[PDB]
Amino acid sequence: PYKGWKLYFSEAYADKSPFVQKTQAFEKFFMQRIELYDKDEIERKGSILVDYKELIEDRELTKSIPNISTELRDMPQKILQCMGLAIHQVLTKDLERHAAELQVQEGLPLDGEPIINVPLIHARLYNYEPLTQLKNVRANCYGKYIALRGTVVRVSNIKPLCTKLAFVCGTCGDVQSVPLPDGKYTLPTKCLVPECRGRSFTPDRSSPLTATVDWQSVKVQELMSDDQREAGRIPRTIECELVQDLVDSCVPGDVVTITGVVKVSSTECVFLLYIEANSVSNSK
Amino acid sequence: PYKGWKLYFSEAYADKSPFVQKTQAFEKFFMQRIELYDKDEIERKGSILVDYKELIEDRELTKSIPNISTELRDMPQKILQCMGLAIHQVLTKDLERHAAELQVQEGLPLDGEPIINVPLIHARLYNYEPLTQLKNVRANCYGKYIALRGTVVRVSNIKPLCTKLAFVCGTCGDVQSVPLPDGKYTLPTKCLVPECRGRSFTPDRSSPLTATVDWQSVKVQELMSDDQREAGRIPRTIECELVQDLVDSCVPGDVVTITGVVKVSSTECVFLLYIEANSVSNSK
Amino acid sequence: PYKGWKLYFSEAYADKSPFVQKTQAFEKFFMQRIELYDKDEIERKGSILVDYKELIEDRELTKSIPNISTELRDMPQKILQCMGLAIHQVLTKDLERHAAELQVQEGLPLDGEPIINVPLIHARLYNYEPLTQLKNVRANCYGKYIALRGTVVRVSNIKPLCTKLAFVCGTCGDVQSVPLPDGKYTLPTKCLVPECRGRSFTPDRSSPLTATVDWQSVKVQELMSDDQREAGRIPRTIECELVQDLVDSCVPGDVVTITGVVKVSSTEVFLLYIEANSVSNSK
Amino acid sequence: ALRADQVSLIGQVFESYLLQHHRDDILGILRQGDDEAHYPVLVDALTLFETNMEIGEYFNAFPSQVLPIFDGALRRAAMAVLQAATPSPELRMKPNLHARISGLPICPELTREHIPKTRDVGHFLSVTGTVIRTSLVKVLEFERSYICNKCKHVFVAKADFEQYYAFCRPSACLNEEGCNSTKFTCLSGTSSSPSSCRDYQEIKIQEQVQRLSVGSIPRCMVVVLEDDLVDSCKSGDDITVYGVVMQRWKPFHQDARCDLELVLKANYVKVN
Amino acid sequence: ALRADQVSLIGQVFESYLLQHHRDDILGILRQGDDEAHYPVLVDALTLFETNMEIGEYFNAFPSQVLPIFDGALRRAAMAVLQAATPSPELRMKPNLHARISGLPICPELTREHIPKTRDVGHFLSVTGTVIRTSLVKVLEFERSYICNKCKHVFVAKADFEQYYAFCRPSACLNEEGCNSTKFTCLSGTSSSPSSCRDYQEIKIQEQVQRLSVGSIPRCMVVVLEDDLVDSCKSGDDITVYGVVMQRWKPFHQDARCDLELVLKANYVKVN
Amino acid sequence: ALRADQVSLIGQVFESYLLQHHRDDILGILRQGDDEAHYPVLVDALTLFETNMEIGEYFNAFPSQVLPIFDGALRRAAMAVLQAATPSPELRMKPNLHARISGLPICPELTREHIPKTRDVGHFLSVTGTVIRTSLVKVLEFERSYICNKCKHVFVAKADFEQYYAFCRPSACLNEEGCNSTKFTCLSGTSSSPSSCRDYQEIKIQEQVQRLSVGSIPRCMVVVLEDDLVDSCKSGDDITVYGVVMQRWKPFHQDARCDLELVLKANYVKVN
């Protein structure tokens, strides 16, 4: 029906919806830059890195979205999701146009990749200009996009995380997949058929619907100058949660500018902030 | 009714009860002795120290009650609370004459301190003549008043203890305070309202009715003769519980003659004797 | 009739069942050999040591039961129970013959201890020819009888084990004891009373019906050659349960050929632990 | 126990004093961009008490009730100072405002320089102790409200420090929510705004051994830090803590004795 | 179902014996006014056995049953000595009378010098072992008192040595109406005032190495001391713990193995 | 998912390949006396793939489903080899037959030396890692027959690899008649003798640091060995693990996040 309606359109298309305008602005920005990036490399990595200094651009790119920094700060997850929709849609339209061109060239109804199924891309942005160190990091910046400059001290070995868990209900008899934010498995509750309501709550790992993305934990401490003896005090360390392509990007002993949305850790005085990394830029 | 009756005794004021005669005898004894003691200092400390040798004085106190030592041994708490009622009542009646004279001179309808509430004072006696060393202390000493010539080794920092935890009932809608011996909340059960009866049980420390008295735990061990190397072995360490003014009176490394009633350490290896200290007399 | 089978349970001994015929074969074998063993010494020990090598002999020993090694491997518990039943029966019948002689001598039909209850003695087999090393020991060996030549490293102090736990039901008001395999108490469930049917489940130890046997846990490691430096690696060890007379027979630092039944240790994913049948010392 | 009219009087007096006193300070507070940030106003205790004695005695009697009234006075004083100020984009209103009490009237009775005893619960006094243990910045979501499906019900669950900073649990089914009440609502997961989380720190301060009041062993006082006061102090320095003495009690049990430890929810921390 | 006739015979014969030999010891016991120490009477085993053959076999067969009857015989013997004695207030009666049986005839069958195995449960025997670890003196409770408002409850349950010192409550009460509530919890019941709390010192004794009965590693027997016997044992000295061998079993769990370890409720720990 | 006809085709071609190639190995397998023992057939991947291209793609797509069909082909080939062999007592049938696939065709996508990432779950590959820890040989109660109040309940529960070896439960409740059938009574728990095990074990293989693919810290992969593969590897030995990558998830809790780690059920362990 609509572009990316299955996953990204949780809400149906609405011209009044502010989300649509952000999607159009981001997809236009990408469409200017499609020639530079490599489509196959992006699909292989499953993500795209876009410089934030290029994101903050005059005239049309800032006309559609008046305050890009404010919008990214207030709702980092929403803006990143809209940017991912924009990149996924521009890649889909590029593949559609390329398939049409291939059909024109060969002159045959059959074409390569008939399904034209585009895997999900998590758009990522780096070189975020406003940067906050441990002193600026506090509970106020919860749910706000921040940029750090701190070396990683401890790196966890790669571990999986269940981003989507399929739930099969005995009364329903069919599997239901629910989006899962950073684990913490959520009850599906309502189901498709009104009468059954999905009363049974059974996890099902066997289903292909259940998808898994790797989770890597790295702890970063902001750089502390050694010019003074008072300087060099033990620095605060904030945990970093990485996902998908970002895993293995960090290497211990290397300063990384981890610019991403930050969230509290329920498991862990009951919570403590960790930045759910959106992009990691290596020193080299 | 006698002022301060409810704070010391839950059971109502009844002249037929034998405790009344003990209270009157102690009131007379304090009346002879009230000149030496300072009323304001006693009120500030919340305690009074009376030498046991004064308790063993012949004639009247021996005639009024036959066996002070036996009554202290069998029921320490009842005799101690009777003595505290006596000191409270004699202080109240002295203040009553003073307020009566002051009212005579001033002729003011609202007298100074019209509520005239006198804080309850836990009467405490020192130099208890029968000494029961901790080695002599048997399990039958529970509920008995003993005196220990022991050296404190470990002094815990001052920790609050809830002597009264007012319980508000949601069904009733009112707040009722229950006497709380060393925690272990006692269900108020029946209340003033007959029908509601207090079905709900919700603790409420925010209420002013809830009161707290500090609790400092000190462990004492008997000094042992150093004639032989095999001698001088540290005897069993018996815990000691201080409360109210007694807290911070003990200092580690100092011998203290702790004369107090003993209870069982149900809170726990599993059970030890701890003396709920009544009076602690330092070496100096 | 036979004591302890028809009295406890309505079902009688079935000659059709091959287990009963196995008991007959073993009791005949003990009958021909009973001269060497001592009755009172065996009763004092509470068990009889019968050679597996002697039992593996041909002719009537193999004629009575075709595959003695295969039967003993497949269901060691049933074979050992039948063997102990046979030795118990032959000892009882020997004492009955002696009591008959005593009655003839005295001339009084009444005799001391007419009930003549005789303790149950577990039959024990040593020198088990098929030997399984600890490397060979696998989940396939579970439920089978193995013989291992290993040196015990750790011997736990003697600890009681409730082989029989009496149970009294509040509604019923009577006490019955249920057999208990290596602790892990099984609820009595049904009882004699039909209507009450034992709905109340109360474990008690004060009852004399409750019985207890020794349980000494010894851990054995297989003896390793010192020929090569590759040899000397950490040895495989399986826990060994010693019960009844077997306790204190093991001593730390000694090599013992523990020919015992192996079962799973549910407490600690399971690890095979050999419920020892017979422990033969080096000497 | 404060009456509504009395609360209004205290708030009005505090507003007038802080407007006449910290006009430049409140303007500078409104200067910064980050509205979510915590802001100290640093109103002096002794001069405020000289201005009106009733507010002083009420502050001494019930600090835990007076301070929210001071926060409301901050809110409306900020209203007035912003409407007075010319530039709107440069000067933004700060809903996150907290009153800081400093310069307490130096009296042995009014200010307990020693570590407080249990007699000092619900009393404002100036503990002077040297930090020994500095816990990390463990933020806490004080409000874990379970929003009702029906409109205007707005069920709210708030963490209380007396209850060992444990969130209130809606075990009772008095509300129409019933089982829906006790089940968790992932307000924090959906967005930042539904979750009201601001930071929480614990530091233990022992009385200075130089002072004659201290005993044989320096008694340790645990201090709960909040808002901007977090990270204001580091281990190993002389610290003066102006705060409200409070007691926290762990979820209590029938057999267990009550386990209370006195805490000082700091109202102002000054590094000496 | 115990016969009353045999109990009465054992009690009367034992009390007559102890009167005609241990009279002066009972005079000394009552003469000491203090109740601080539980008072032992120390009746010798072999002379008691030779005086009456029935007592010997009953005591060896059922020591845990005989010893309470011996305490009752002590109560009647104390009645007799009190009425016999001339001065009433100098010597007073003591409910806490306990019979300690020592001087057992040294025989391999009578006295199992080696630490008992599971064959020796419920048999009185000498365990000559050197104490290694001494636990702290404990109050415990003779019973977690069952307080019932309903009259003539006449239900008595006591802390069982066999059940790891855990209070036992039968499923159905003896009375026809039964208990008002299945479990009754009261402050008096939780407190040890209604119960006869006694010292409890749990020591572990190992075999003497010089003895031939010891193995490669000395076996260890855990010994429970009660009443006066607590504090009689000191670590590092040889102890001849005449006692009744029993079995403690921890609360059973269906998957878990029945966990029972041998114990010895001491009768008189004579220190060599 | 595989269809029945596809299963039949794959099994038939696998049986034909083993009959034409590994027949002598099957003879050697049935020659051994111990029937309960586990036996490797050692089928080679590249030859099997070049014989039939459908087998290659289907095995690479769904190893976990293909391997049981391979075991069924083992059983049929064992039927054929048993009827082929003249001596009956010498050649005994082996119910415990498990296919071993070795020598994958050299392809970076099919076989990748690196420790698998979460993308590699459900795919067959060669994971070359040096064993660091060798956990003890802990056999698994893989199957426990469950009978309940329901007539002929005969419920069969298999310890699932993805479930951290917790017994599987029906998604749709068949025990509608009573709660007794809903609850599970462990037959193995009551009596030790009746059970069955597959010789479970765990080793962790750490990627060789000398290789270019490995990162700064060599990643470790935990390997689950089942049946005869146990005791085939030792710590500190260069080990190549051809296996099927799956993931275990610990029992979930509402507050707790999904706790998973990649695991590798080895299909062949070869000492380099």
Numbering used by the authors:
A (entry chain D), B (entry chain F): 15 to 282, 293 to 308
C (entry chain B): 15 to 282, 294 to 308
D (entry chain E), E (entry chain A), F (entry chain C): 2 to 273
Pull text from the paper:
MCM8 and MCM9 form a functional helicase complex (MCM8/9) that plays an essential role in DNA homologous recombination repair for DNA double-strand break. MCM8 and MCM9 proteins are structurally similar, with an MCM domain at the N-terminus (NTD) and an AAA+ ATPase domain at the C-terminus (CTD). The structures reveal that MCM8/9 is arranged into a heterohexamer through a threefold symmetry axis, creating a central channel that accommodates DNA.
As our previous study shows the hMCM8/9 helicase complex is unstable for high-resolution structure determination, we first solved the cryo-EM structure of the MCM8/9 complex from Gallus gallus. The structure reveals that gMCM8 and gMCM9 alternately assemble into a pinwheel-like hexamer with a central channel. In addition, a distinguishing feature of the gMCM8/9 is that the helical domain of gMCM8 contains a long α5 helix that protrudes around the hexameric ring. The dimer interface between NTDs of gMCM8 and gMCM9 is largely composed of the β-strands from the OB domain of gMCM9 and the flanking ZF and OB domain of gMCM8. Compared to the strong interaction between the dimer interface, the interaction within the trimer interface is weaker. Therefore, we presume the current structure of gMCM8/9 may represent a loading state of MCM8/9 helicase.
